[PDB]
Every structure is written in structure tokens, then in C-alpha cells.
Amino acid sequence: KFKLVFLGEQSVGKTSLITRFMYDSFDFLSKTMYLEDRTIRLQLWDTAGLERFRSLIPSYIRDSAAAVVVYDITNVNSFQQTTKWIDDVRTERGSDVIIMLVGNKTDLADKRQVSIEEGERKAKELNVMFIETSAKAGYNVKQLFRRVAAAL
Ligand SMILES: Nc1nc2c(ncn2[C@@H]2O[C@H](COP(=O)(O)OP(=O)(O)O)[C@@H](O)[C@H]2O)c(=O)[nH]1
Numbered sequence: 001k002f003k004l005v006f007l008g009e010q011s012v013g014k015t016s017l018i019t020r021f022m023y024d025s026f027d028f029l030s031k032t033m034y035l036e037d038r039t040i041r042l043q044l045w046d047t048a049g050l051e052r053f054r055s056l057i058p059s060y061i062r063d064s065a066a067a068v069v070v071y072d073i074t075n076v077n078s079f080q081q082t083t084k085w086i087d088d089v090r091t092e093r094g095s096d097v098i099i100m101l102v103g104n105k106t107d108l109a110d111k112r113q114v115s116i117e118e119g120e121r122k123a124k125e126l127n128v129m130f131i132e133t134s135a136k137a138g139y140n141v142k143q144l145f146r147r148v149a150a151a152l
């Protein structure tokens with residue numbers, strides 16, 4: 001079993017990605033996944049409010065094996081804040097944690113402010129994994145979780 005925490009500014013789609021993956025709908029939780037030689041259980045921790053209650057970050061993310069740090073591709077501030085979220089994960093967890101940086105809302109194509117290239121560069125700069133998703137369209141949501149699960 002592996003504790004996976006979702007992190008990111010308000011309104012980026014942290015809950016929506018979990019919903020889409022767990023229930024396949026769009027408006028902790030346990031999910032078992034089957035890998036070639038392994039079978040593992042992900043515990044998906046989601047919360048609102050963390051950007052307001054910063055001092056709770058260390059304890060909320062305490063024993064995480066993975067952190068999925070989400071921004072909204074139409075919202076530059078949400079992308080800029082992901083360095084801060086990732087620094088919170090490293091401070092608490094060191095290198096004992098898989099991190100996936102996620103640019104969500106790819107279906108809002110005409111409102112995009114962060115190109116896929118800038119997301120990829122930030123991920124490479126910080127040595128984390130990267131993907132883009134649409135929770136609404138269901139694009140790359142299963143890919144996100146299968147890559148994280150394979151890396152654990
Ligand atoms: N167009 C679009 N809207 C989304 C997507 N994901 C989430 N949203 C919307 O963005 C808002 C915030 O999503 P939510 O899951 O609540 O974000 P959270 O605050 O990060 O949990 C809601 O109105 C969602 O319907 C997406 O992939 N595409």
C-alpha cells in the first residue's frame with residue numbers, strides 16, 4: 001500500500017482527477033492496481049484548503065510515497081506555485097517519493113497559458129515526472145495513475 005497525496009492551488013482539478021479516475025465521472029480513497037509482476041493499493045488523499053493552512057502541509061503529506069502536483073494550463077499563477085508545492089514535498093520526504101507534475105484542463109485549448117514545453121521544462125528542472133490531462137474529457141487520467149503506479 002502507498003500513500004499518494006494530491007497538491008496544488010485551488011480549482012486546478014485535483015478532486016476532478018480523482019473522481020474521474022475512481023468513478024469515471026466528472027461534474028482517502030483506495031484503488032488497487034495490477035502491474036505485470038505486482039499488485040499494489042494506492043491510497044488517494046485529497047483535501048481542500050491546504051494553500052490556506054500551510055503549517056498543516058508537513059503533517060498532511062507525512063508518509064507519502066507519491067505526490068501528484070496539479071496546475072491548470074489556463075492559469076499561470078497555478079503553474080508558478082507548483083515549485084513551492086514540490087519544495088514542500090522534498091522538504092518533508094526527500095528523494096523517497098515519486099512526484100508527478102500535472103498540467104490539467106487540456107480541453108480548454110483556446111485559454112491555454114502554459115505551453116506543454118514550459119510544463120516539460122519545469123518538470124525536467126525539478127527532476128519530476130510530467131503529464132498533461134483533461135479530467136473533464138477523460139484524457140490521460142488513467143495514464144497518469146498507471147505511470148505513478150509503475151514508478152512506486
Ligand atoms: N474544462 C475543464 N474543467 C475542469 C477540469 N478539471 C476540473 N475542472 C473544473 O474546474 C473546477 C475545479 O475543479 P476541482 O476538481 O474542484 O479542483 P480542486 O480545487 O483542485 O479540487 C471545477 O469547476 C471543475 O469542473 C478539466 O479537465 N477541464
Ligand SMILES: [Mg+2]
Pocket residue numbers: 014015016047048
Ligand atoms: Mg478539491
